[PDB]
């Protein structure tokens, strides 16, 4: 393919060459951004940025800007050129719209498809994320179609596809790849066990699990891998409005797809943008026509490093800590979900602790988790000792019976996919007449 | 491959030839599947157009028995997508498609007499979970360049309140949802402060399927949404779209893409027209060949020419709504009741109802706002007296009884798993965040 117009891993031999692949797109990107009502209004009465050098002066685009411009204030092409329209997860009251041409979709699908394990025609790919307005289900399906994998559209949060039916599909279709968030990986494992199947042995064709959408510690990621037989759990970082911006290498670090976007770290205190360090993730996608974004702040706290990785990819690594501002403090001690997660998932695998939750009170950390009765007291004691050793916070830890946080019906209930029925026989329950879901 | 378009045939004889010329390929493809290889093991299988007249019907129970890949005629490497049918979960029905199979599927859906255009914004409000329906409409929208808004259905992510907001704010021009969902969206619109007959000026057509739909109900759904076309099609997960509405309001069989026959289940005879069970042999599919697949829907196929000038037979689908219940001296079909319910004046706003056939009496409930309820009860009773003569027990209910207010107004944030909460936060959304 002498013919392909977007860069691939291996097209650049140095960071200087990568920087050139980026800057050579900025005149097109800056001209396209100005066609949107939002950027045309932003630079009204001034000379707009046109050149690679002008980009250093470009003002950040905030989430609140995208919400204020709902639905099509960020639109730079005729609506006739849109292929799909999406809205972000989170608050329903203040939606964020994103939208993509067919050519925009090719870039999106390529970035998702950068899975170090490969996606092949030989694969059966269960897409277990939502298709309702959000991009995630559509994105995985598009990458599956691109690479010829058989796509099984599992959807998520749909009454049509409960966990019991997904477990049966995983086993009976010999599914080789999955796409779902890390909590859904443990939900599927709990559903398998409730169906009398061992996730570590009874799914021999499952070769990788693709995941995103949650901050994921290496301790949790490795436990999720071990639960499913030691297979790779392949993380990516993305959003509805950016698509996939980073993907895992074989060493287990996420690398920024810097050939497809200019990535900057925003220090909200000084207002400076830097190519690496700690701060808020800023993205300028290079290969989109419909919805240009100039220095869009995802407002995730990230650590970007240019330090080499054992994978040898010539791309910076990124750790995603969480959403900016989300931390809690109890003693002098900062309590992060990420620190608690590392302690919970360091309990021996034999204790089967997967489901937990915690509440920061001013004085004390309240934490609950499900564990089988025989190991429950051990789990409470060891997790307490871990909190003492690592954080020194006062705690109130309660072990719960399985079925308490995650009900049995979520794991085992089957649901017929009915249609509206208006006339029933005497013996039939007519309660499913109009509300048939 | 080269697939026919409306207008490629000038007569029924030419249509019959477009079909028969595909049958050698279709019969050889079917034989590659374990199911048809086993069916014709130790015989000479059918090879020619003439041999097709002798081909045994394929039943739904065959597709269930062959779960998952007994109907598969290509290497799995060539599959693009895998689907399972709606209905019983305990006994799944698998279907699957190559990329080229998908082009035929998308083309058949896209035969919408109103057109699908790049100028369109197309809300897909059917499920994407395993079933084909959401994927099919999305594929046809992508094929014709319409902006696809993936609404999904039966998803906690996309309640009615949010779909009504999307209809209005995105100037949606086309919808895809079942006929019950058309009335659910109308009730949700009023609950959002929007009049379905006036406040959606860019909505130009509503595409629908999946339910038996009387012309009386279809015309009422049109009137509720300001007199815009309600464009019906007939399909299934295992066949795709097999008939679509013409501008005269009849569904025409897509006979250029499939051989349609009417099955008498008592004699087992197959006829090109008349009353009986819908039998389909798709002509342009490689992955999952079907020879005379019996959808087991009760249909009436007619060869009578239509004012639309399409040279294709028309089909009415009675289905499960065609099957009588004896009550009084009389026999009552869902389709006959539906015609009487939707013959009540539009201004009574009767959209949601249900009925139970007892041996002695028809029990029927419907929502009607105060103060038209007792008029509606009386007129519907008189209609049942005049038309059916069945004893009835009719109850008018307050709106919010059959279709709860919560279904129409509830908004739901799309949350992710959260493990650490502040004191004042509800931590019940920790692991069960849907
Ligand atoms: N691998 C990851 N690690 C950590 N956080 C992640 C990861 N992937 C996604 N996220 C988080 O999820 C966000 C994107 O959520 P997603 O639903 O995929 O898009 P969205 O529709 O923009 N939702 P939202 O921003 O939450 O309103 C990112 O900004 C991060 O906060
Ligand atoms: N226009 C229509 N009029 C009447 N019935 C229809 C119409 N369209 C679809 N149907 C019914 O819906 C069935 C197909 O349901 P659908 O969910 O679209 O496919 P499926 O998931 O394959 N279901 P099934 O094969 O019956 O188990 C048809 O066989 C008919 O019974
Ligand atoms: Mg368009
Ligand atoms: Mg394949
Ligand atoms: Zn690496
Ligand atoms: Zn016609």
Residue numbers in the entry:
A (entry chain B): 0 to 436
B (entry chain A): 3 to 436
Mind quoting what the paper says about this structure?
We reconstituted the biosynthesis of the benzoxazole moiety found in nataxazole by adding two enzymes (NatL2, NatAM), to 3‐HAA, ATP, and Mg2+. We have determined the structures of both NatL2 (homologue of BomJ) and NatAM (homologue of BomN) from the antitumor nataxazole pathway. We show NatL2 catalyzes ester not, as previously reported, amide formation; the amide is a shunt product.
There was no electron density for bound Mg2+.
